[PDB]
Amino acid sequence: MDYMERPKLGLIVREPYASLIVDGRKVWEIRRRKTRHRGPLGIVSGGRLIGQADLVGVEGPFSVEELLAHQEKHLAEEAFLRAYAKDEPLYAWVLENAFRYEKPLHVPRRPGRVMFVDLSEVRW
Amino acid sequence: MDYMERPKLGLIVREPYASLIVDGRKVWEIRRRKTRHRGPLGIVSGGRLIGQADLVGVEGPFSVEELLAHQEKHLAEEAFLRAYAKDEPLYAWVLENAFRYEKPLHVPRRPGRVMFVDLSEVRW
Structure with missing residues (x-):
């Protein structure tokens, strides 16, 4: 929305999820942790920075069943969710x-591409 | 040195380079970009966060020849440097x-490990 500042960090997201996010249709991004x-987070898809979103919170842990109650938020197919979660907890980045x-x-x-490890959850 | 704050981002560094850095023997970390x-940057080696360092500047681009003039700063073997650079420019993270x-x-x-793409060099 006409910003001067740009995000310092990006997240690799596969289509169609990447587009759903930057097009404002997907407010919940599902991840294993x-x-x-x-703050701002660039959305990287297919080796291109296509847009960004503000990460303002994290919900979870969820079971696949609990997520299906919020289909409109993540737009993820049940088949893919189960195959992804592998019977393990999932989180939703808001x-x-x-x-x-x-x-x-x-x-x-790659391989020149610089990637940083997220240490925000490390048990200090 | 007895800090309360911890780094939010980490960099994966292979041994023996990881140890040389956190032990204060290596002030230049060689990278392709x-x-x-x-600011602070955690040093991740073998899946463990072993320490940290402050990234305060970047020197370069260097040719392998130019780096050998600073052997004491990076402690990297010429054989490995050339095999790494592949006849291309290198940079030194200070x-x-x-x-x-x-x-x-x-x-x-992996694969739960969250990694972020460094967008600091993106041509906006």
Whole structure:
């Protein structure tokens, strides 16, 4: 929404989920773990930075059954959820203010691409 | 050095380089690309967070020849440097205030492990 600042960190998201997020249709991003990161987060899909969203909270842990009660929030197929979770807990990263950039930006390809480990959940 | 705050991001570094860094012997970390990240950075080796260092600057680009003039800063073997760089430019991430934690901390294993893409060099 016409911002001057850009996110410092990005998250790799596969289609169609990446698009659903930046197009503002998906406010819950499903992951196997929590994160304490808060604020803007770039959405990287197919090696291109297509947009961003603000990560404002994390809900969970959820069982697949509990997530199906929020189908409109994640738009994830039950078949894929179960095959993904593997009978284990899932979390939902809450997003808002998501938008798609006018032009997708290029992200450094592997292996030069710098990746950082999220240490926000480390037991200090 | 008795800090209360901990780094939010970590970098995966292979031994013996990881140890050389946290033990304060290696102030230059060699990488294929630059980064604008500044401040504390956890050093992750073998799936364990062993310590941290402050990333305070980035030098480069360097040719292998130019780096050999700073052997004491990176402690990297010429043979490995050339085999790594592959006839391409390299950069040196400048580190300081590095120390090894009293006890190495566990980092979430794959594939649950959350990794973020460094977008600091993206051409906006």
